[PDB]
């Protein structure tokens, strides 16, 4: 993280569950990284993705859709 002198010290500044943000570990095999390509008018611009890496559990929970659905609500795509 930072060491007695400050300073990052030690490897791998971890992932985090881009929904719950619970930490993402290293053996999550139901976690996924969506980079979702942004629209422009008529298209999409890409380079610009909203990007997430999200843990497995929710997938177990129906909140892989759903929670992300809120999350995605909090990031709106095509909406009313």
């Amino acid at each position: 993280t930072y060491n007695e002198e400050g300073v990052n010290v030690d490897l791998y500044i971890p992932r985090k569950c881009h929904a719950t943000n619970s930490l993402i570990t290293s053996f999550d095999h139901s976690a996924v990284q969506i980079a979702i390509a942004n629209v422009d008018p008529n298209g999409v611009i890409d380079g610009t993705t909203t990007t997430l890496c999200i843990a497995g559990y929710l997938r177990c929970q129906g909140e892989s859709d759903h929670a992300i659905n809120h999350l995605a609500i909090a990031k709106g795509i095509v909406r009313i």
Partner: protein, 223 residues
């Protein structure tokens, strides 16, 4: 092969000298399968590749105590990563070797720590955390730069191979049950990235598929 084609694209990309680091897997969230990927990625001299346990396995069965060997390889290198193997084989060595691959495969990132507070660098666990197993209990506790550490010989070797020196231990359980002990240990070792830190965390910025960042490249010399 000795010229193991790393048939994963990752192992490809990797073999193909892009992204050779564990962390890139861990970071990128990646899983593995292909053993050479690591074995490729990191292999600088001694790493601290090890066989640990050597067990007979039986299925009793009419005309047979069907005997097999289970063997444990721990793979590690002295800071941040360990790689676990148990494997069984009908030949002992084979079990080792089988375990070797599992050992390669079962690599984990180790968030180390100190104790009290930071010193020049960590060398401890960064937390007090626990591995439990059938009859096993250790909780591994933060110590500082000069500890002989509580508990078992057995993991200790590994710990060293993964890069930590001083952590406190409370071991509780059927040491009796050494196979499990290591399994517990590994598990413990796995929670070496557990706990919501208040200590870096902040926000993880995105990092996009380093694999699918070379998708086309991965689709070239490759379909």
């Amino acid at each position: 092969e000795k010229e193991w084609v790393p048939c994963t694209k990752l192992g490809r990309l990797v073999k193909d000298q892009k992204i050779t680091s564990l962390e890139e897997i861990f970071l990128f969230s990646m899983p593995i399968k292909e053993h050479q990927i690591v074995d490729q990625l990191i292999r600088e001299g001694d790493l601290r590749d090890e066989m640990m346990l050597v067990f007979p396995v039986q299925k009793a069965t009419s005309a047979g105590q069907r005997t097999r060997f289970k063997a444990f390889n721990v793979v590690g290198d002295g800071n941040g990563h360990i790689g676990v193997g148990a494997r069984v084989g009908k030949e002992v060595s084979l079990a080792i070797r089988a375990s070797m691959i599992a050992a390669k495969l079962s690599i984990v990132p180790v968030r180390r720590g100190y104790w009290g507070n930071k010193i020049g660098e960590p060398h401890t666990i960064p937390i007090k955390v626990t591995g439990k197993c059938g009859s096993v209990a250790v909780r591994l506790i933060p110590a500082p730069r000069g500890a002989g550490i509580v508990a078992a010989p057995v993991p200790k070797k590994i710990l060293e191979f993964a890069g930590v020196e001083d952590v406190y231990t409370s071991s509780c359980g059927k040491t009796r049950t050494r196979g499990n002990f290591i399994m517990a240990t590994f598990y413990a070792l796995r929670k070496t990235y557990g706990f919501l830190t208040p200590d870096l965390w902040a926000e993880t910025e995105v990092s996009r598929d380093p694999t699918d960042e070379h998708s086309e490249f991965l689709s070239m010399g490759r379909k």
